[PDB]
Each structure stands twice: as C-alpha cells, then as structure tokens.
RNA sequence: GCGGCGG
DNA sequence: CCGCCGC
C-alpha cells in the first residue's frame, strides 16, 4: 500500500523548477508532506531517487523511507515511480521463480495486493 | 554438539552459511544481531558528491548525453571503489570525455592507491559531439547516509549524493528446525549474504562477529 | 514441490501413465538388486546424516530422477512379458 | 481459433470481447452431452480441466 | 518490542488481561496410532478393545476421494492388504519386516 | 529384538529416532479431514518429524 | 494424572473466541513490553 | 571515547547497566541478544523432587495441614536457594516442624555452604497434631524442565516437581539518544536486569556475554 | 440400536 | 457427513 497525507498547498511541480526547489524546502519545513497530492511527483519522489533495486530497501532498513512510501526507482529499463513495498513484492515473486522477467510479466505493482490480485497471480 | 559451520560460496557476491545444531531459539539470537551489523557497521565505499562543470541543478539534461543528471548520479551510486590504506579518507575521481563514445567507469583517470573493480559500469552515452567532464568525490564510511544528511560541498555548485557504504547489499537468515536423536526442538541457522564485490560474504561475516566481540568486551570495568 | 514434475508430465501422454512407469520402475530398482540404475556416477541422489542415499533410502525418488533423463524407455508393448524378468536376473547380481 | 483447440481463459475473454462487438452469438464446442464412447468420455470431449491446466489425461475418473 | 529482534513492532498494539479458559478438550482423547493388531473374528475388521487401537474407517465418501485421484493401488491397498486378504496383509507385513 | 526394544523402553533417544527419520526420508503419508467432500479431502505430504501430540498442517491447504 | 497445557489443548474466552494452542513459545523471544514484562498469549486479530 | 560501562547495583536482585556511546543502532544490536540469553541460558537452582513422610501421591492431603500436597509443592517451586560451589550439584534440604506453627523456608535445617534467600516464603499452615516432615531435593541447572522429563526418584514414594532454572525474572533495555560525540545520531544502551537472588545482576550479565562470545567462535572451521 | 459432546 | 463417550 501507498500513503497519502496533507496537501498544505500548491501542488504544481508539474511545471515549475522553483517548484522543485521551493516545494522541496517547504517539505523540509512543515508545509509539504513526503506524500502530497502533487501530480507528476510528490516531494516524496523528488528527495529520494534509488539507482539499484537494493538501494531502495537499505534506505528503508536505515529509517530513511517507510515501506509504504512513494519513491522513485531505477529498474531494468525504466525509471519507475513505485514504493519500496511494491518493489519488495516484485523481488519476492521474482525470487520464488527464477525467471525474473517472466515474473514482472505476470504481476501488477500498480495497486496494493488484494486477495484477487494474488488469486490471479497464482 | 558443536555447531557445524558449513559454507557454500559462489563468487564474491553470494555466500550461504549454515550453522547447527543450536539451542532453543539461538539461531535468532545470532542471526538478527549479525544482520543489523552486516548492514550498519561494515566499512566500505560510496560516491559522496559529484560535479559536472556545465551543470547546476540535480534535475537537468546535458546535451550530447542521453542520460539525465539523475540517471547519471544514480549510475555512480552503483560504482564500487576499493581503497588500499587509511591515508585515503576522501579521494576525488576525475574524468572527462568528448564526442561519440560510451563513458564507462574505467575511463576515470587512474588514482595512486585506489582501484576500480566496477569497470564496465555504464555511466553515460555521449552523442555526436558531447562534452562531459566532472569530478566525483568518494569516501570511506559505514551504513547509508542520505545525500541530505552529509551535504558535501567540494564545488559550491556541486550536488550531494546518497552514501552507499556497506559493500553488503542484503542479508537474509532462516531458523528452521533440525533433528538430533533425542530432542527435535532445535534451531538451525543459515544466513545468506549478498555483496557488491568489494569484500566477500565470508570476510564480511567474520568482521561482523569480531565487531560484536569487541563490543562484548566493553562490559569490563564498572563505576 | 517435486523435482521437474513438470518435465515428467510433459514426457507422458497421460498423467496416470507417469505414475505407473514411475512405480514399476521403483520395483525393478529393488527386486533385481539396487544397482540396476543408470545415473550412479557424479550427481546421484543423496541424504544428510551421512551421504548414504547412495544405497537404498527411497526407490521412487530414483525412478523419477532416472526418468528425468533420456536413459529409460517406456511403452505399451516394448518387451515380451516374461523375457524381461529372465534377462534382468542374469545381468544383475 | 483452429478446430479442436482447447480455449484457455484468455481465449474466452476474447470471445466475450468479440460478442461485445457483435461477431459471434454461440460457440461450437465438444462436450460429454454428445460423446460417442458408450461407457466413457474422451479427451477432446471432456476438456481442459484437470487438477492441472493442460488437457485431461486419459484414465481420469 | 519483538523480543526476537528487540526492535519494536511498528504500530501500537493492544494488550491486556483477558480471562480465558481451557476446555474439557485434552488431546488424550485425540490420538490413536495403529501399526497392526487384533481383528474381529466375525467380520475381519481391525477392531480394538484393550491393547490395540482401532483403525480409522474409510467409508465410500473417502473411497470416491481416492477414486477421483486415480489412486489405484492406494485404493486397492485400503480394501485389500489393509483389510480382508488375510494372505495379503500377511505378505505385506513380512515384506516390510 | 528391535520389537522388544520398543516394547517398554522410554526413549530410544537419537538412534532409534535417527533410524525412523531415515526410514521416512522420501516417503509421504495421506491426511484426511472430517467430511471427505471432494478429492482434495485427502492430500499427501512428506512427513517432517516433530515434538508433541498435535499434527502440523500447512495453512494454504 | 496432571494435565499441563500442551500444543493439542484448546482454550477460549467468554465471548466466543475459541482455539487450539499452536506453539508454546520460550519467554525468551515473545512480545515483551517496554518494562521487562512479556505477554502470555497472542491472539490473532483476524478472528475478531 | 570507549563504551563507558557504568553500574548501579542495589541488593542482588536489581542491576542497571549503562554503556555508551555506541555507533548508530548497536545499542539495540547488543541489547536484545543479551536479553534473549539472560532469560533462556543462565543456570540456576530449583526444587527437583519432594517427599512427605506419610504421603504417597502428589494429590494427597496431610492432616492438620490446610494446604494440599499440590498447593505445597507449588509453593516450593517458589523457593529460591543459592549454593556456592560446583561441589554442590544436588543438595537435599530437610525440614520437620510439628503442632501449632507456620512453616516458612527459614525452618529448613541449615546446609553449610548453600543459603536460602527466600526466607519468609509461606510453605504451610499447621493446626494441631500437624505432623509435617519432608525432604526437598534441589539442583543446579538451566532452563525449564517438566517434572515428567526428569522424573527424579530418591525415595520410591517421592513426587518430582517442575524445574524453574532461570535466576532472572525480567530483562529490559533502553536506547537513549546521547552522551558525547561529534554527531548527535548516537546510541546509549542501558539494560536493567532483575534476579530472584540466586546470582546477581552483574553475574548474569557476564555469563550472558560469555555464552554470546562462546557461540561467536563456533564460526571457525568451515566445511 | 437409545443419550451426550466435538468439526 | 466423522470421532468419541456409555444402558
Ligand atoms: Zn466423445
């Protein structure tokens, strides 16, 4: 699952660069949450960008990011905007069955896992 | 009976370690603490700060370079460097390449006591014409430090990078039950370790255990 | 679950077929002696108190393990009923 | 969709999506209701279901 | 805190004094383990009595279960070697010995 | 002898146990549930010896 | 004889939560409070 | 800057132990393993077997004696004795009082080297013509042992009792923010141990630490 | 075969 | 449906 908090104001980074900076310092303040309704990316994605998949989880393990937080992560060929948790799930499945590619070919990390999303995965 | 310490290691990245039998719930008493250490204490390397001449912000795009600042600063986190001695606390890697060439990690100009065991690591693709020059700082630390925590300012206009110190990627341990003639309520500890290559799973484990030992001793003198 | 049960199923025209071959084969493993195998070299089954699965723990495990490879052949009427058991005793002590 | 082919879930999604458009109202399919084998039913007539998912193994109760 | 890891369990957890009871259900009435023994002298059933436990019934409800599986011998075994062929169960026992 | 060995003796410790655990190696047993309704009413599992009285069953089944 | 609680035994509260003992955990590693006091039993939330 | 192991010990029961500074999360890496050992591993003492003269079974009643055999033996497992040397593996305390009196653990006839820190423990209440003479067997062990597991038989008509060997009732550890250091992100582990009296807070801690070290070495010979 | 409980 | 306990 992903979390949503409080949108203290303006959610326009969809275009301003003083919106990446300002909205990112406003976040450092008490104004904009790490998970704000900010179209393209909530400050939550601006701050943390994780290269390798592992990179993401360690930050978690050190307390930087909760599993249910919206961050950005570089996977095999795409810069994906998904939470650690989701990604972790991907790994678990990709581990269960060695064909990692065929793994993500059959799972949807676009929604929290419901009994059905899993039913269908099985 | 004595803990049979079995080892199954392939390369310098993966290392399975089994150790049984153990008394009631000891596997957990060992594994977990080893883990916390293996990811927090182990010393290694990570790029701290980078600086591309013509670049200002973290989110941009250098002409002649398909990669975006972010994708590049990311690629660098992947870079694994290995120092040879204490005298090297902070080393600044330098690299400049132009034109129609692929920029690999081996293109950085060699440093005296530093070694790059992450050669073929893809850093950037420079198109027909494409000036790419920059200086990436590297340090020896422990654990993970967010680029917002340390904030290194070599070049006033440079950008801090998340510190990926532990040469250990992930740690996993399992406590399955094992049989010993008389009593079946037994622990069997197998801990699997993943490393970037700078050090091996086996060396890391030992260093860990040592570090725990060194701390156990600090309980010596009362007051 | 089981070792290459997928592969196994794909080698037979019918599920139950597999079982039968598997079984009867386990029978021959013990009847005509336990050396009537085909993959005893390096990479044969094994246990953990010692490495003694090399003699006679579970028969079927062998069968399947042997059938996973193109060593044995199974068919409706491959060899004349009685002649099979006579030749086997002769070449297996 | 050739003859005899055992239509998988996907293939039944297709047919539905197609009926949506308006290309098929019924479906020609083998079934026990019309098996010739006096005492028994064959592979092509029973179908895809098995404890598994591939076609039914002959010899199943 | 976990106790195994000493690390907390993210999120307050409710705890308290709850009054709970043990029921007249001991497992003493719940487990007979029979390898072989006494058989009825009228019908040939592994009935029990004193030293030998009884064998669970298999009913047709369960045979079907087996039939379906295609459990040929597993079913054969339940109706023969394990029940009526006095020479079957015999050979079986011996063989296993 | 082996039988008398199990007739009154309390444990048999590791060795009798070593043997049992050895005899069960790859064998499996069947399990049955109260009303046996469908074919899955009985499933086969590899036994892994354990302490006590209860029988450990897999959650998914 | 004395009936000590063991894995097969079944307990339950006055409200209706009925159940059997699955595992007898060593105080060593079971859910303890800030102050040394560990818990006695852990009920699965899902049955409520 | 080296873990300043401080101590505040009052009596033989309570015993706080403070140790800092420590590097980011080790207070917890140490705190829990030691806790898991302190409760499960530490050796101690407990009433292993008892024998009342005219009583044959555990479920009997003794004349002029309010409490039942079961109520008594129960109270005996609450008895905390303390030996002083290995030479004392199995001690048998003997006690016999009659008439109008209250039997308290102090009425045991002294056993020279071994002492009873559980004095006022109420053993029983005697009416008139209340004849109670019993021998209670004690041992030095580790963990929990069900009276059914050992089945001690000094006298053919004695009844074995349940074994409670952990000389600690509760362990607790805290990880406070700071003492000294360049960086504020530091751990200050203070653990407070509670003992029935048999051994001391410090004594336990040390044994614990040792059992931990002992296991650490078991990582020696690979295979 | 009558009665009581459990799933 | 199955398992037990008792006149
Ligand atoms: Zn047909």
Q: Are B90 and B138 in contact (CB under 8 A)?
A: yes
> Computed from CA positions of residues B66, B71, B77, B80, in that sequence, does the dihedral angle turn out positive or negative?
negative
Instruction: Work out the minimum CA distance from D57 to partner chain E, whole angstroms.
Output: 11
What are the distances in angstroms from CA B173 to CA A57, B18, B33, B190? 16, 10, 11, 6
Q: Which chains contact F through at least 3 pairs of Cβ atoms less than 8 Å apart?
A: B, C, E, G
* C-alpha to C-alpha distances, H84 to B155, D6, G22, H201, nearest whole angstrom: 68, 82, 40, 16
How far is residue C27's CA from residue C21's CA, in Å, rounded to a whole number? Answer: 10
Sign of CA dihedral B70, B71, B72, B75: positive
Chain E environment of H33 (Cβ under 8 Å): 6
Torsions phi, psi for C14 (to 5 deg): -150, 145
H221 burial class (0-12, 13-18, 19+ CB within 10 angstroms)?
exposed
Can you state the angle between helices B201-217 and H26-40, rounded to 10 degrees? 70
Alpha helices in H58-187 (DSSP H): 69-77, 147-150
Q: Is D36 annotated as a binding residue?
A: no
Q: Which residues contact E84 (CB under 8 A, 6 or more apart)?
A: E44
Rounded to whole angstroms, how far apart are CA atoms B171 and B204? Answer: 11
Give the bridge partners for H96, in sequence order.
H133
CB-side neighbour CA atoms (13 Å) of B146: 13
Chain H residue whose CA is closest to E6: H32
B15 sits in which H/E element: strand B14-22
Q: Cα–Cα distance between H190 and H185 in angstroms, integer?
A: 16
Alpha carbon of D4 to ligand 1 centroid (Å)? 12
d(CA A92, CA A84): 12
For B214, the 3-state DSSP assignment is helix
- Give, in order, the Cα–Cα distances in Å from H43 to each of B24, B183, F5, H184, H193: 15, 20, 35, 39, 15
In order of A114, B217, H181, H211, the CA distances from H189 in angstroms are 41, 15, 15, 20
Per DSSP, what are the bridge partners of residue A74? A79
Give CA–CA dist B26/H143, Å, rounded.
13
CATH number of A1-122: 1.10.274.100
F35 inside 8 A of chain C by CB: no
Burial class (CB within 10 angstroms; exposed 0-12, middle 13-18, buried 19+) of D15: middle
Strand J: which nucleotides have any atom within 7 A of a protein Cβ? 1-5
Nearest to H28 among E3, E4, E7 (CB): E7
- Distance (Å, rounded) from C-alpha B148 to C-alpha B145? 8
Percentages (nearest 5) of helix, strand, coil residues in chain F = 35, 15, 55
Residues of A in contact with B136 (CB under 8 A): none
- How many alpha carbons lie under 13 Å from residue B139 in its C-beta half-sphere? 20
Whether the CB-CB separation of B39 and H46 falls below 8 Å is answered with no
Report all structural domains of chain C as residue ranges with CATH numbers, in order of start: 1-93 (3.90.940.10)
Cβ atoms B67, B75 nearer than 8 A: yes
- Which nucleotide is the nearest neighbour of E23, by CA and C1'? I6
Best mutation target among C9, C15, C19, C22 (most E Cβ atoms within 10 Å) is: C19
CB B155 within 8 A of CB B55: no
Question: E25 CA to I4 C1', in Å?
Answer: 15
Question: Is B48 within 8 Å of B152 (Cβ atoms)?
Answer: yes
Contact B81, B118 (CB under 8 A): yes
Report the run of H or E that residue B191 belongs to, with start and end. Answer: strand B187-195
Protein CA at E75 to nucleotide C1' at I2, angstroms: 35
DSSP line for C63-84: HHHHHTTTT----TTSS-HHHH
CA atoms of C47 and C43, how far apart (whole Å): 13
How remote is the C-alpha of A25 from its chain's centroid?
20
Q: How far lies B101's CA from each of B68, B105, B132, H6, in Å?
A: 16, 13, 11, 62
E16 in contact with C, Cβ within 8 Å: no
Q: How far is B183 from chain F (nearest CA, A)?
A: 8
Which residue ranges make up each domain of chain H? 1-43+166-219, 44-165
Chains H and G physically touch (3 or more Cβ atom pairs below 8 Å): yes
Ramachandran angles phi, psi of F11, nearest 5°: -120, -55
Residue H211 and residue H182 in contact, taking contact as beta carbons nearer than 8 Å? no
Q: Is G23 exposed, middle or buried (0-12, 13-18, 19+ CB in 10 A)?
A: exposed
User: Which residues put CB within 7 Å of chain I, the nucleic strand?
Assistant: E 25; F 34-35; G 18
Contacts of B24 in chain G (CB under 8 A): 26, 28
Which strands sit side by side in the sheet containing A49-50, from one edge to the other? A49-50, A72-74, A79-80
CATH superfamily of H1-43+166-219: RNA polymerase, RBP11-like subunit (3.30.1360.10)
- Taking CB atoms and an 8 Å cutoff, what residues of chain C touch D52? 9, 15
Q: Kindly give the pairing relationship between strand B163-164 and strand A72-74.
A: unpaired
Separation between Cα atoms, residue A11 and residue A33, nearest integer Å: 11
Pairing verdict, β A72-74 and A49-50: parallel
> How distant is the alpha carbon of residue H15 from its chain centre?
15
Across the interface, do B41 and H23 touch by the CB < 8 Å criterion? yes
Considering only CB atoms, G11 lies closest to which of E9, E13, E23, namely E23
Measured between beta carbons, the chain F residues lying within 8 angstroms of C48 are: none
Give whole-number Cα distances, D16 to A40, D1, D28, in Å.
Answer: 36, 14, 14
Q: Where are the beta strands (DSSP E) in chain G?
A: 10-13, 18-20
Question: Looking at the complex, does the CB of residue F15 fall below 8 Å from at least one CB of chain C?
Answer: no
Cα H52 from Cα E45, distance rounded (Å): 50
Phi, psi for residue E37 in degrees, rounded to 5: 160, -170
H/E segment holding residue A59: helix A53-61
- Subunits next to H (3 or more Cβ pairs <8 Å) are B, E, G
**How far is F43 from D51, CA to CA, in rounded Å?**
12
The partner residue sitting opposite F18, judged by closest CB among C49, C53, C57, is: C49
Q: Which nucleotide is nearest to E59 (CA to C1')?
A: J2
Contact H141, H57 (CB under 8 A): no
Contact between H28 and H172 under an 8 Å Cβ cutoff? The reply is no
**CA distances from residue A88 to A1, A20, A31, A56, G27 in whole angstroms, order as listed:** 12, 28, 30, 9, 31
- B184 in Cβ contact with F50 (< 8 Å): yes
Going by their DSSP bridges, the two strands H168-176 and H187-195 should be labelled as antiparallel
Compute the distance between CA of residue B174 and CA of residue B195 in angstroms, rounded to an integer: 18
Nucleotide whose C1' lies closest to the alpha carbon of residue G10: I6
Q: In whole angstroms, what is the distance from residue E82 CA to residue H149 CA?
A: 36
User: What angle, rounded to 10 degrees, do the helices at A53-61 and A84-96 form?
Assistant: 120
Q: Which of D8, D56, D49 is nearest to C13 (CA)?
A: D56
Q: Which residue of B has its CA nearest to G24?
A: B185
User: How many whole angstroms separate alpha carbon B202 and alpha carbon B213?
Assistant: 17
CB E70 within 8 A of CB C15: yes
d(CA H35, CA H191): 9
Taking the alpha carbons of A58, A59, A63, A68 in that order, is the dihedral positive or negative? negative
Distance CA F42, CA C79 (A): 37
Closest-CA residue to H108 (of H74, H88, H81): H81
- CA–CA separation, H96 and H109 (whole Å): 9
Query: Is E14 at the interface with chain G, CB within 8 A?
Result: no
The C-alpha atoms of residue H70 and residue H159 are separated, in whole angstroms, by: 10
Q: Which residue is nearest to nucleotide I7 (CA to C1')?
A: F34
Calculate the angstrom distance between C1' of J1 and CA of E58: 13
SS3 H10: strand
Q: What is the 3-state secondary structure (H, E, C) of H145-157?
A: ECHHHHCCCCCCC
Query: Is D42 labelled a binding residue?
Result: yes
Has D35 been labeled as part of a binding site? Answer: yes
- Residue E49: partners with Cβ closer than 8 Å, 6 or more residues away: E38
G15: left (phi over 0), alpha (psi -120 to 50) or beta: alpha
> What is the full DSSP assignment across H178-215?
-SS-SSS--EEEEEEEEE-SSS-HHHHHHHHHHHHHHH
Helix axes C15-31, C59-67, angle to 10 degrees: 120
Alpha helices in B2-121 (DSSP H): 26-40, 69-78
How far in angstroms lies nucleotide J4's C1' from the CA of residue C49?
A: 41
Is the CB of D58 inside 8 Å of chain E's CB atoms? no
CA angle centred on H140, ends B22 and G2, rounded to 5°: 85
Q: State the chains in contact with G (3 or more Cβ–Cβ pairs under 8 Å).
A: B, E, F, H
B1-43+166-219 and B44-165: same fold?
Answer: no
Best of B184, B186, B187 to substitute, by most chain F Cβ atoms within 10 angstroms, is: B184
State the Cα–Cα distance between residues H158 and B9, nearest whole angstrom.
56
Whether A12 contacts A19, CB under 8 Å: yes
Q: Find residue A50's DSSP bridge partners.
A: A73
Q: How far apart are CA B40 and CA H187, in angstroms?
A: 13
User: Any residues with CB less than 8 A from the CB of B43 and at least 6 apart, and which?
Assistant: B140, B141, B142, B165
Nearest protein residue to nucleotide J4, judged by CA and C1' positions: E29
Specify the CATH superfamily of domain H44-165: DNA-directed RNA polymerase, insert domain (2.170.120.12)
Confirm or reject contact between E28 and chain H (CB < 8 A): no
B197 Cβ contact list (under 8 Å, min separation 6): B12, B13, B80, B117, B118, B167
The enclosing H or E element of H133 equals: strand H132-142
B222 to chain A, minimum CA–CA distance in Å? Answer: 32
Region for residue H214 given its phi and psi (left: phi exceeds 0; alpha: psi -120 to 50; beta: otherwise):
alpha
Beta-carbon contacts of F2 under 8 Å, excluding residues fewer than 6 positions away, are none
- For D51, half-sphere exposure in the C-beta direction (CA atoms, 13 angstrom radius) is 13
Q: Which residue is nearest to nucleotide I6 (CA to C1')?
A: E25
Q: Entry resolution in angstroms?
A: 4.3
| Cβ distance of F53 and G20 shorter than 8 Å | no
The verdict on G28 touching B (C-beta cutoff 8 Å) is: yes
Residue B138's nearest CA partner among B19, B45, B36 is B45
Residues of chain F in contact with residue B179, where contact means CB-CB under 8 angstroms, are 17, 21, 49
The sign one gets for the Cα dihedral H55, H58, H59, H61 is: positive
Q: Is C47 within 8 Å of F18 when comparing Cβ atoms?
A: no
Verify cis geometry, omega within 30 degrees of 0, for the bond prior to H42. Answer: no
Q: How far apart are CA D16 and CA A12, in angstroms?
A: 43
């Amino acid at each position: 699952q992903v979390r949503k908090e409080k949108k203290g104001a303006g959610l326009e980074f969809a275009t301003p660069e003083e919106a990446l900076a300002a909205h990112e310092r406003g976040e450092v303040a008490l104004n904009a949450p790490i998970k704000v309704a900010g179209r393209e990316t909530s400050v939550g994605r601006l701050k943390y960008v994780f290269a390798n998949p592992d990179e993401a989880l360690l930050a978690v393990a050190h307390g930087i990011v909760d599993l249910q937080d919206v961050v950005t992560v570089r996977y095999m060929g795409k810069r994906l905007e998904t939470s650690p948790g989701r990604i972790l799930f991907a790994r678990i499945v990709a581990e269960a069955v060695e064909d990692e590619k065929v793994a993500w070919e059959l799972i949807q990390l676009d929604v929290p896992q419901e009994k059905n999303s899993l039913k269908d995965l099985v | 009976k004595a803990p049979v310490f079995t080892v199954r290691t392939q390369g310098r990245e993966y290392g399975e370690f089994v150790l049984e039998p153990l008394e009631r719930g000891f596997g957990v008493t060992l594994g977990n603490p080893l883990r916390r250490i293996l990811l927090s204490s182990i010393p290694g390397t990570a790029v701290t700060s980078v600086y591309i001449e013509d670049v200002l912000h973290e989110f941009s795009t250098i002409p002649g370079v398909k990669e975006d600042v972010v994708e590049i600063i990311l690629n660098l986190k992947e870079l694994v460097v290995r120092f040879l001695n204490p005298s090297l606390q902070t080393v600044t890697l330098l690299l400049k390449a132009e034109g129609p060439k692929e920029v690999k990690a081996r293109d950085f100009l060699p440093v005296a006591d530093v070694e790059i065991m992450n050669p073929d690591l893809h850093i950037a693709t420079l198109e027909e014409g494409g000036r790419l020059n920059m200086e990436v700082r590297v340090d020896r630390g422990v654990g993970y430090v967010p680029a917002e925590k340390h904030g290194i300012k070599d070049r006033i206009n440079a950008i801090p990078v998340d510190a990926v110190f532990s040469p250990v990627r992930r740690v996993a341990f399992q406590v399955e039950d094992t049989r010993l003639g008389q009593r079946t309520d037994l622990d069997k500890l197998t801990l699997r370790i993943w490393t970037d290559g700078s050090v091996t799973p086996l060396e890391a484990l030992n260093q860990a255990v040592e570090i725990l030992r060194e701390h156990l001793t600090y309980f010596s003198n009362p007051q | 679950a089981e070792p290459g049960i997928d592969k196994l199923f794909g080698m037979v025209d019918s599920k139950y077929r597999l079982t039968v071959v598997v079984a009867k084969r386990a029978q021959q493993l013990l009847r005509h002696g336990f050396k009537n195998t085909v993959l005893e070299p390096e990479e044969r089954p094994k246990m953990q108190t010692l490495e003694g699965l090399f003699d006679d723990p579970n028969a079927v495990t062998w069968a399947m393990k042997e059938l996973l490879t193109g060593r044995l052949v199974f068919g409706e009427n491959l060899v004349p009923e009685d002649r099979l058991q006579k030749e086997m005793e002769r070449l297996y002590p | 969709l050739e003859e005899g082919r055992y239509l998988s879930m996907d293939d039944v999604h297709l047919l539905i999506k197609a009926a949506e458009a308006g290309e098929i109202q019924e479906v020609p399919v083998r079934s026990p209701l019309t098996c010739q084998t006096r005492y028994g039913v064959c592979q092509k007539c029973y179908g895809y279901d098995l404890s598994m998912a591939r076609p039914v193994s002959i010899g199943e109760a | 805190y976990d106790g195994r890891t000493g690390e907390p369990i993210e999120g307050p957890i409710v705890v308290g004094q709850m009054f709970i009871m043990k029921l007249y259900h001991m497992v003493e009435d719940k487990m007979h383990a029979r390898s072989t023994g006494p058989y009825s002298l009228i019908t040939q059933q592994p009935l029990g009595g004193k030293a030998q436990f009884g064998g669970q019934r298999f009913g047709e409800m369960e045979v079907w279960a087996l039939e379906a599986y295609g459990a040929a011998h597993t079913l054969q075994e339940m109706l023969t070697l394990k029940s009526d062929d006095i020479e079957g169960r015999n050979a079986a026992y011996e063989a296993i010995i | 002898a082996a039988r008398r060995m199990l007739e009154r003796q309390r444990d048999i410790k590791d060795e009798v146990w070593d043997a049992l655990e050895e005899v069960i190696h790859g064998k499996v047993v069947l399990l049955n549930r109260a009303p046996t309704l469908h074919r899955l009413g009985i499933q086969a599992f590899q036994p892994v010896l354990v302490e006590g009285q209860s029988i450990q069953l897999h959650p998914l089944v | 004889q004395k009936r000590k609680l063991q894995v097969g035994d079944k307990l339950a509260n006055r409200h209706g939560n009925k159940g059997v003992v699955a595992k007898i955990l060593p105080v060593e590693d079971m859910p303890h409070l800030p102050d040394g006091t560990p818990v006695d039993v852990i009920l699965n939330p899902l049955g409520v």
